[PDB]
Design an enzyme around this catalytic site. Sequence first.
Site, PDB file in Angstrom:
ATOM      1  N   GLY A   1       2.644   3.610  -1.469  1.00 15.25           N
ATOM      2  CA  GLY A   1       2.983   3.921  -2.816  1.00 15.25           C
ATOM      3  C   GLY A   1       1.693   4.056  -3.529  1.00 15.25           C
TER       4      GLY A   1
ATOM      5  N   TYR B   1      -2.453  22.286   0.939  1.00 10.76           N
ATOM      6  CA  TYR B   1      -3.176  22.838   2.066  1.00 10.76           C
ATOM      7  C   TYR B   1      -2.111  23.451   2.973  1.00 10.76           C
ATOM      8  CZ  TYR B   1      -1.413  18.433   3.671  1.00 10.76           C
ATOM      9  OH  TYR B   1      -0.540  17.421   3.969  1.00 10.76           O
TER      10      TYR B   1
ATOM     11  N   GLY C   1      -1.391   3.578  -5.547  1.00 13.02           N
ATOM     12  CA  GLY C   1      -2.361   2.496  -5.462  1.00 13.02           C
ATOM     13  C   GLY C   1      -2.084   1.675  -4.207  1.00 13.02           C
TER      14      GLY C   1
ATOM     15  N   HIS D   1      -4.627   5.355   4.978  1.00 12.57           N
ATOM     16  CA  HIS D   1      -4.432   6.625   4.311  1.00 12.57           C
ATOM     17  C   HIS D   1      -4.986   6.518   2.910  1.00 12.57           C
ATOM     18  CE1 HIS D   1      -1.615   9.593   2.353  1.00 12.57           C
ATOM     19  NE2 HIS D   1      -2.162  10.261   3.317  1.00 12.57           N
ATOM     20  N   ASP D   2      -4.764   5.447   2.135  1.00 14.20           N
ATOM     21  CA  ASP D   2      -5.423   5.285   0.834  1.00 14.20           C
ATOM     22  C   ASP D   2      -6.932   5.294   0.987  1.00 14.20           C
ATOM     23  OD1 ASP D   2      -2.800   4.710  -0.028  1.00 14.20           O
ATOM     24  OD2 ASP D   2      -3.257   2.714  -0.817  1.00 14.20           O
TER      25      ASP D   2
ATOM     26  N   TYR E   1      -8.028   8.971   1.563  1.00 19.96           N
ATOM     27  CA  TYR E   1      -7.957   9.737   0.307  1.00 19.96           C
ATOM     28  C   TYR E   1      -9.126   9.399  -0.610  1.00 19.96           C
ATOM     29  CZ  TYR E   1      -3.416  12.078   0.423  1.00 19.96           C
ATOM     30  OH  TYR E   1      -2.364  12.889   0.713  1.00 19.96           O
TER      31      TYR E   1
ATOM     32  N   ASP F   1      -3.456  13.106   6.049  1.00 20.68           N
ATOM     33  CA  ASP F   1      -2.003  13.150   6.139  1.00 20.68           C
ATOM     34  C   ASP F   1      -1.447  13.212   7.574  1.00 20.68           C
ATOM     35  OD1 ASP F   1      -2.056  13.019   3.317  1.00 20.68           O
ATOM     36  OD2 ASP F   1      -1.501  15.160   3.025  1.00 20.68           O
TER      37      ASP F   1
ATOM     38  N   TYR G   1       0.738  -1.241   0.000  1.00 27.04           N
ATOM     39  CA  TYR G   1       0.000   0.000   0.000  1.00 27.04           C
ATOM     40  C   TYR G   1       0.777   1.306   0.000  1.00 27.04           C
ATOM     41  CZ  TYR G   1      -4.216  -2.679   0.628  1.00 27.04           C
ATOM     42  OH  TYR G   1      -5.329  -3.458   0.385  1.00 27.04           O
TER      43      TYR G   1
HETATM   44 CA   LIG Z   1      -0.855   3.422  -1.837  1.00 24.03          CA
END
Ligand SMILES: [Ca+2]
Lengths: 123, 123
Positions: free
Chosen positions: B30, B73, B32, B48-49, B52, B99, B28
């Site tokens: 990176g 931001y 995708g 975190h993916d 997002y 983040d 994960y």
């Molecule tokens: Ca990823």
Amino acid sequence: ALWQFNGMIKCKIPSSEPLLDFNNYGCYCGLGGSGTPVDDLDRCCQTHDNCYKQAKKLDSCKVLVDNPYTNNYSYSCSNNEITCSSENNACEAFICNCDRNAAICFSKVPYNKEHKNLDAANC
Amino acid sequence: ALWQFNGMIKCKIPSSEPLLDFNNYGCYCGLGGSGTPVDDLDRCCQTHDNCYKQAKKLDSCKVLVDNPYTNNYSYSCSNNEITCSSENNACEAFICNCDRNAAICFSKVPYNKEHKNLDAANC
Ligand SMILES: [Ca+2]
Ligand SMILES: [Ca+2]
């Protein structure tokens, strides 16, 4: 930059539009400035103009071709307090502090509409 | 954006170069990601993916044509703590928090070099 300073003063004075309310006030709040400050808000502006001129003497700032109102730095506003970020390189960190201090000063002094758009013959 | 996230993880892990050290890790961390996280750092990346991807469902985020790794931001790093600024509009504020959380997660889990550049046949 101008746009970080605008938000720092609204961080501290949330009802305000800084670019309208504090622009063209007294002898110093605005581009340039000469003469004796007409009041304490004006003295806040004189100190910030001196801070920006001090910044320009810094060797760190010599590389910055974007001069201070375009020189972007990082800060956050949280619970109406301002914090200059550690990711700021030395020049940006100096300007951020100049800005922090002027915004906090502006929130502690009286605002006098009489001095809004004060005729230059006064400076 | 990518560049605010890089500094948030160095806010928390100052010895690191996040774009080298955490890029291409597990299934994960990176671009995708699919499959089961290989460890806790990888599970930080999966969360975190998902954050997002949650952000993209927000109606606030619908106007943001610059998608999340270019969507800038504001935040500050001070004494190795991260603060998402109140000047962030809702979309940016959602990504900032995504983040913040991933950087703090990355600082609390083991780092396993075995999983660095882990072959995709594993995901
Ligand atoms: Ca990823
Ligand atoms: Ca001035």
